Amino acid sequence: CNFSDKEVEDCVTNRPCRSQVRCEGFVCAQTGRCVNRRLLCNGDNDCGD
Amino acid sequence: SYQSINIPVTQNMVPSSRLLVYYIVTGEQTAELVSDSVWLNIEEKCGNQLQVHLSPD
C-alpha cells in the first residue's frame, strides 16, 4: 500500500493555545535547550550548539 | 516597577531610625535571600513638645 496511513492539513487559528513552556535558564539560540547559567563559558557544549 | 516606600515617619521613629528591605528569589532551582538597609535620621522632635514660657515676658 501507499505510504499514506497518515494525512495532515493546515488550519485557520480558530483559537490560540498556551505558549511554549517558560525557560528560567539560558535559551540556546538554535536548539532552544533551556540550560543553567552555570553552564555558560563552561568549556563544554551543553546546547548541541 | 515596584511600589515605593510611601510611609508616614510615625512619632515612634523620631530618634534616628533604620530601614531594611529584602526579597527571596527562588532562582533556577536555588533560592537566595537578597536584602539591603539604610540609615534614616528623623530630626529629634519630641512627642509631647512641651512648651513652657514666662507669660509676663
Coordinates of N, CA and C in Angstrom, one line a residue:
Chain A
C1 N 0.8 -1.2 0.0 CA 0.0 0.0 0.0 C 0.9 1.3 0.0
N2 N 0.3 2.3 -0.5 CA 0.9 3.6 -0.5 C 1.3 4.0 1.0
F3 N 2.4 4.7 1.1 CA 2.9 5.1 2.5 C 2.1 6.4 2.9
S4 N 0.8 6.2 3.1 CA 0.0 7.3 3.5 C -1.1 6.9 4.4
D5 N -0.7 6.1 5.4 CA -1.6 5.8 6.6 C -1.8 7.0 7.5
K6 N -1.0 8.1 7.2 CA -1.2 9.4 7.9 C -1.6 10.4 6.8
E7 N -2.4 11.4 7.2 CA -2.6 12.6 6.4 C -2.8 13.8 7.3
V8 N -2.4 15.0 6.8 CA -2.2 16.2 7.6 C -2.8 17.3 6.8
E9 N -3.4 18.3 7.5 CA -4.0 19.5 6.9 C -3.6 20.7 7.7
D10 N -3.5 21.9 7.1 CA -3.4 23.1 7.8 C -4.7 23.7 8.2
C11 N -4.7 24.7 9.0 CA -5.9 25.3 9.6 C -5.8 26.8 9.7
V12 N -6.9 27.4 9.8 CA -7.1 28.7 10.5 C -6.9 28.5 12.0
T13 N -6.4 29.5 12.6 CA -6.2 29.5 14.1 C -7.5 29.9 14.8
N14 N -8.4 28.9 14.7 CA -9.7 29.0 15.3 C -9.6 29.5 16.8
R15 N -8.6 29.1 17.5 CA -8.3 29.5 18.9 C -6.8 29.6 19.1
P16 N -6.3 30.5 19.9 CA -4.9 30.3 20.4 C -4.7 29.1 21.3
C17 N -3.5 28.9 21.7 CA -3.1 27.9 22.7 C -2.0 28.5 23.6
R18 N -1.7 27.7 24.7 CA -0.5 28.0 25.5 C 0.8 28.2 24.8
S19 N 1.5 29.3 25.1 CA 2.9 29.4 24.7 C 3.7 28.2 25.2
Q20 N 4.8 28.0 24.5 CA 5.8 27.0 24.9 C 6.3 27.3 26.3
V21 N 6.6 26.3 27.1 CA 6.9 26.3 28.5 C 8.0 27.3 28.8
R22 N 7.8 28.1 29.8 CA 8.9 29.1 30.2 C 10.2 28.4 30.5
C23 N 11.3 29.0 30.0 CA 12.6 28.6 30.4 C 13.2 29.6 31.3
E24 N 13.4 29.2 32.6 CA 14.1 30.1 33.5 C 15.6 30.3 33.3
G25 N 16.2 29.3 32.6 CA 17.6 29.3 32.4 C 17.9 30.1 31.1
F26 N 19.1 30.0 30.6 CA 19.5 30.5 29.3 C 18.9 29.6 28.2
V27 N 18.5 30.3 27.1 CA 18.0 29.6 25.9 C 19.1 29.5 24.9
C28 N 19.5 28.3 24.6 CA 20.4 28.0 23.4 C 19.7 28.4 22.1
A29 N 20.3 29.4 21.4 CA 19.7 30.1 20.3 C 19.1 29.1 19.3
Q30 N 19.9 28.3 18.7 CA 19.4 27.4 17.7 C 18.5 26.3 18.3
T31 N 19.0 25.6 19.3 CA 18.3 24.5 19.8 C 17.1 24.9 20.7
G32 N 17.2 26.0 21.4 CA 16.3 26.4 22.5 C 16.4 25.5 23.7
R33 N 17.5 24.7 23.8 CA 17.7 24.0 25.0 C 17.8 25.0 26.2
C34 N 16.9 24.9 27.1 CA 17.0 25.6 28.4 C 18.1 25.0 29.2
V35 N 19.2 25.8 29.5 CA 20.3 25.3 30.2 C 20.6 26.3 31.3
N36 N 21.2 25.8 32.4 CA 21.5 26.6 33.6 C 22.7 27.6 33.3
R37 N 22.5 28.8 33.9 CA 23.5 29.8 33.7 C 24.9 29.5 34.2
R38 N 25.0 28.5 35.1 CA 26.3 28.0 35.5 C 27.0 27.2 34.3
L39 N 26.2 26.8 33.4 CA 26.7 26.1 32.1 C 26.8 27.1 31.0
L40 N 27.5 28.2 31.2 CA 27.9 29.1 30.2 C 29.4 29.4 30.4
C41 N 30.1 29.5 29.3 CA 31.6 29.8 29.4 C 32.3 28.6 30.2
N42 N 31.5 27.5 30.2 CA 31.9 26.3 30.9 C 33.1 25.5 30.3
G43 N 33.4 25.7 29.1 CA 34.3 24.9 28.3 C 33.7 23.7 27.7
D44 N 32.4 23.6 27.7 CA 31.7 22.4 27.2 C 30.5 22.9 26.4
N45 N 30.1 22.2 25.3 CA 28.9 22.5 24.6 C 27.8 21.7 25.3
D46 N 26.8 22.5 25.9 CA 25.7 21.9 26.6 C 24.4 22.1 25.8
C47 N 24.5 22.9 24.7 CA 23.4 23.2 23.8 C 23.2 22.2 22.6
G48 N 24.3 21.5 22.2 CA 24.3 20.9 20.9 C 24.5 22.0 19.8
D49 N 25.1 23.1 20.3 CA 25.2 24.4 19.6 C 26.2 25.2 20.5
Chain B
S1 N 7.8 47.9 37.6 CA 8.3 48.9 38.5 C 7.6 48.6 39.9
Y2 N 8.3 48.8 40.9 CA 7.9 48.4 42.3 C 7.4 49.6 43.1
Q3 N 6.3 49.4 43.8 CA 5.8 50.4 44.8 C 7.0 50.9 45.6
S4 N 7.0 52.3 45.7 CA 8.0 52.9 46.6 C 7.5 52.8 48.0
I5 N 8.4 53.0 49.0 CA 8.0 53.1 50.4 C 7.3 54.4 50.7
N6 N 6.1 54.6 50.3 CA 5.3 55.7 50.8 C 4.8 55.5 52.2
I7 N 5.4 56.1 53.2 CA 5.0 55.9 54.6 C 5.1 57.2 55.3
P8 N 4.2 57.4 56.3 CA 4.5 58.4 57.3 C 5.7 58.0 58.2
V9 N 6.6 59.0 58.5 CA 7.5 58.8 59.5 C 6.8 59.0 60.9
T10 N 6.3 57.9 61.4 CA 5.5 58.0 62.6 C 6.3 58.4 63.8
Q11 N 5.6 58.9 64.9 CA 6.3 59.6 66.0 C 7.3 58.7 66.7
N12 N 7.0 57.3 66.7 CA 8.0 56.4 67.3 C 9.3 56.4 66.6
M13 N 9.4 56.9 65.4 CA 10.7 57.0 64.7 C 11.6 58.2 65.0
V14 N 11.1 59.1 65.9 CA 11.8 60.4 65.9 C 13.2 60.3 66.4
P15 N 13.6 59.3 67.2 CA 15.0 59.0 67.3 C 15.5 58.4 66.0
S16 N 16.6 58.8 65.5 CA 17.1 58.4 64.2 C 17.0 56.8 64.1
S17 N 16.4 56.4 63.0 CA 15.9 55.1 62.8 C 16.5 54.5 61.5
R18 N 16.1 53.3 61.2 CA 16.8 52.5 60.2 C 15.7 51.7 59.4
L19 N 16.1 51.4 58.1 CA 15.2 50.7 57.2 C 16.0 49.5 56.6
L20 N 15.4 48.4 56.4 CA 15.9 47.2 55.7 C 14.9 46.7 54.8
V21 N 15.3 46.3 53.6 CA 14.5 45.7 52.5 C 15.0 44.4 52.1
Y22 N 14.2 43.5 51.7 CA 14.6 42.2 51.3 C 13.6 41.5 50.4
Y23 N 14.1 40.5 49.6 CA 13.2 39.5 48.9 C 14.0 38.2 48.9
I24 N 13.3 37.1 48.8 CA 13.8 35.8 48.3 C 13.4 35.6 46.9
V25 N 14.4 35.3 46.0 CA 14.1 34.8 44.7 C 14.6 33.4 44.6
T26 N 13.7 32.5 44.0 CA 14.0 31.1 44.0 C 15.0 30.7 43.0
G27 N 15.5 31.6 42.1 CA 16.5 31.3 41.1 C 16.0 30.2 40.2
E28 N 17.0 29.6 39.5 CA 16.7 28.4 38.6 C 16.1 27.3 39.4
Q29 N 16.8 26.8 40.4 CA 16.2 26.0 41.5 C 16.7 26.3 42.9
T30 N 17.7 27.2 43.0 CA 18.3 27.5 44.3 C 17.8 28.9 44.7
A31 N 17.3 29.0 45.9 CA 16.9 30.3 46.5 C 18.1 31.1 47.0
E32 N 17.9 32.4 46.9 CA 18.8 33.4 47.5 C 18.0 34.4 48.2
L33 N 18.3 34.7 49.5 CA 17.8 35.9 50.2 C 18.6 37.1 49.7
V34 N 17.9 38.1 49.2 CA 18.5 39.4 48.8 C 18.0 40.5 49.7
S35 N 18.9 41.4 50.2 CA 18.4 42.4 51.1 C 19.4 43.6 51.1
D36 N 18.9 44.7 51.5 CA 19.7 45.9 51.7 C 19.0 46.8 52.9
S37 N 19.8 47.7 53.4 CA 19.4 48.5 54.5 C 20.0 49.9 54.4
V38 N 19.3 50.8 55.1 CA 19.7 52.3 55.1 C 19.4 52.9 56.4
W39 N 20.2 53.9 56.8 CA 20.0 54.8 58.0 C 19.1 55.9 57.6
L40 N 18.2 56.3 58.6 CA 17.3 57.4 58.4 C 17.2 58.2 59.7
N41 N 17.8 59.4 59.6 CA 17.7 60.4 60.7 C 16.3 61.1 60.7
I42 N 15.7 61.2 61.9 CA 14.3 61.7 62.0 C 14.1 62.9 62.8
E43 N 15.1 63.8 62.9 CA 15.1 65.2 63.3 C 14.6 65.4 64.8
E44 N 14.6 64.4 65.6 CA 14.6 64.6 67.1 C 13.4 65.4 67.7
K45 N 12.3 65.5 66.9 CA 11.1 66.2 67.5 C 10.4 65.3 68.6
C46 N 10.2 65.9 69.8 CA 9.5 65.1 70.8 C 8.1 64.8 70.4
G47 N 7.5 63.9 71.2 CA 6.1 63.7 71.1 C 5.2 64.7 71.8
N48 N 5.6 65.0 73.1 CA 4.9 66.0 73.9 C 5.2 67.4 73.4
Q49 N 6.4 67.7 73.0 CA 6.8 69.0 72.5 C 6.4 70.1 73.5
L50 N 6.6 69.7 74.8 CA 6.1 70.6 75.9 C 6.7 72.0 75.9
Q51 N 5.9 73.0 75.7 CA 6.3 74.4 75.5 C 6.0 75.1 76.8
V52 N 7.0 75.7 77.5 CA 6.9 76.3 78.8 C 7.5 77.7 78.7
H53 N 6.8 78.7 79.1 CA 7.3 80.1 78.9 C 6.7 81.0 80.0
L54 N 7.6 81.9 80.5 CA 7.2 83.0 81.4 C 6.2 84.0 80.6
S55 N 4.9 83.8 80.9 CA 3.9 84.7 80.4 C 4.2 86.2 80.6
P56 N 4.6 86.7 81.8 CA 5.0 88.1 81.9 C 6.4 88.4 81.3
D57 N 6.5 88.1 80.0 CA 7.8 88.2 79.3 C 8.5 89.6 79.7

